[PDB]
Symmetry: D2
Subunit: 242 residues, 4 copies
């Protein structure tokens, strides 16, 4: 098992920002033997990113994907194209897709199935909101998200999971490290598998990445905002390599 | 007013399919003086398309777009990037986005506003389904789609409209030409403007494009499936140039 | 002259059993039973048994504020149209804006309710109305045509159905006429009554009723006072 | 022994006024008023006035099949908890699966209804239950905890509330016990009754009631026959 540390750029970076990111990053990243490093740029920029990860230890990830190979899905992205560009990961069911764009557990289930059919390693995002935590149904919320997402899939070891707690308020610490460990243990139990990476996609930055990755159930990170500054993201990768 | 004829590829074509399309197409299209020719490839391929429309009379169109310039919108496409690639059109509120991916009139309204802020010419898609037509509320359905979409926008002449009747059953003729004319007249009335192109995005192919474009309220087409075969799409453009 | 005006009291969720008794006593014994007016009172569903006892052998027609589309079955908390018929209910209010927003009336449900009420000879009052955003946008009429068409599909005798128009708003006469006249064209017959459910007091019942497309009223909180409901009917009586 | 069993009849949308009369006469005069049992009958809302007349000066507790969370107001077709209290309703069924699917009960609405029933001293029966996909997936318990927690937020005295568990299905005892025992842990007190709303006939009422976490039943169509409801209660009576 290698750590999986992904950069989720979300809808950020012009083409010049992306070029300057890859220059700063690929001239300074050490390609640590024990880290799977994934960068997921904006989908419209995956072609350009593709030409920068093709000669790199970086793995191209996509932020979303349709479940069909082709068809009448205006504005959607086909897995066939992600395969063409060398995308090796796909972020599936991110909380922002669930909140804003009609992403359901049933469609997530089709996307994970497609990603495995095409040999793309899907990263399934789950997470409870603040109210669900206060009501004490965090683990229960996650189990339902996981079971409806993973239903009918025989080999879960090919799936990674990001625990992404949903938080309308910023905290810089959407959970305590012990809480993350406990959640990740629970998820690992539901997953029934020791090969899936369970990565924390909560608030991760350079001042807590050490105590977070130290937890034995934390198999890496899915980092949003902090990954947009190349220096900060390198500092975090240094911490992970200890 | 030039005719606006767009190709909506939807989620179709590998990179090789797109290259072979542009070779067949750009070696044979006559760049008719009275046609605005737009091609909208899959979003993940807009960078490649961009390099093929940059030296072409073809206008790059996008199939979808977020309303923010940047932010936490995993899997979304920023208008700043479409501007960078030379996209001059954007398809907004296509029926497939409304049916499958949480596209609302309120979000469509923000997307049209953003497209105009950034000088991208938005193509607003409207259309009633079969039941709405049978109930005799076609025009009424369209007026609501249009008014909630266009609310608060002062200069509608910078907006084009595709009348895209929604039809679960194929017919090859989702409306009769006289019906299209009547609908387009109605839309023109709601639009209060003589510069907007109102283009028919119903079932358009090479055997009806002549009687359709002949209607004076039909200002062009938004073609889906028929536009994926380069020869068929050229035959239609020939008909339009008379 | 081919038409009797329909004037209905929608009590909504108001009045105890005793308030309902004080009302009907003071009302039935003092209301003149005008021949031009179908008078309808719709108390709370739980008080329909009391109300029907007080209006048998009276000219007041009993109305229900909602009902279900099945006769019997596993519909916890629902009211069967059979019970309404046994009780002597002649009207039912279908699709009130309050149900649409709070308790999931869809146009599909409304449609089955109107078909049910017709099969049982209960006369339904379909409630349609635009909200303030829809009038501000200028799509009031288109909004109502959608509501009406979706609610009435497959119903061959629209003359059996009355319509109450009420603008949906948080808690002008020519504008009412214009809206009602449009609704009439959507209905495609003259026999249906198009009653106004917006603000109706005594200052304006006469001006409003005089409009040819205004066939009466659906009166909300103003109808809770028997004296006030009587004063409205007298103004309508000219 | 700290507990009285709760056994309720949910008539749903069944029985005319006359069927309801034949029932209560045959029932009240023949039911032994067991001291260990709170006996509850919930007829149609429109028949609650009749029913209360028949059970004043009787041991049968009257239940309502639904209610609204406000006392009065612009809620066309809704039932006020004040009318229920004046009528002598002691129970109300909240959040029945039929309302959840058909007529838009949300957990937020259910929550205001339970708070209302408590403010008025009406004892609510919260209905929770998983569907077949949720049991097939293996998330039955997690599903119920979500329903319970969302329905009970901010309510400080859960002991005032009973729960009916019914698997939601199209129209085993140890498995019931397992589910009820889990629900008990979510409730965090012993005083709440957890009654089973699944299949309960005379062959199995005894085996089911004997489970320590099964505190009674919510009986649907089987309760429509007075003789059958009496035979169930007698089996429970051992």
């Amino acid at each position: 098992m290698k750590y999986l540390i992904g950069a989720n750029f979300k809808m950020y970076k012009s083409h010049k920002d992306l070029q300057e990111y890859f220059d700063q990053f690929v001239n300074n990243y050490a390609c640590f033997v024990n880290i799977d490093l994934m960068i997921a740029p904006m989908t419209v920029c995956l072609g350009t990113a593709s030409e920068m990860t093709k000669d790199s230890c970086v793995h191209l990830g996509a932020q979303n994907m349709h479940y069909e190979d082709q068809g009448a899905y205006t504005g959607e992205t086909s897995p066939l194209i992600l395969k063409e560009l060398g995308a090796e990961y796909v972020i599936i069911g991110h909380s922002e897709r669930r909140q804003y764009f009609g992403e359901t557990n049933q469609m997530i289930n089709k996307k994970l199935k497609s990603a495995l059919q095409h040999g793309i390693r899907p990263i399934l995002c789950i997470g409870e909101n603040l109210e669900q935590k206060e009501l004490g149904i965090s683990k229960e919320t996650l189990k339902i998200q996981l079971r409806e997402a993973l239903q009918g899939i025989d080999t879960l070891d090919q799936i990674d999971v990001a625990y992404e707690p949903v938080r309308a308020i910023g905290t810089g610490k959407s959970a305590t490290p012990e809480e993350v460990q406990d959640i990740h243990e629970y998820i690992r139990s539901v997953l029934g598998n020791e090969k899936s990476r369970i990565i924390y996609g909560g608030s991760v930055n350079d001042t807590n990445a050490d105590i977070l990755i130290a937890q034995p159930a934390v198999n890496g990170f899915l980092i949003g905002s902090a990954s947009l500054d190349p220096q900060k993201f390198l500092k975090i990768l240094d911490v992970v390599s200890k």
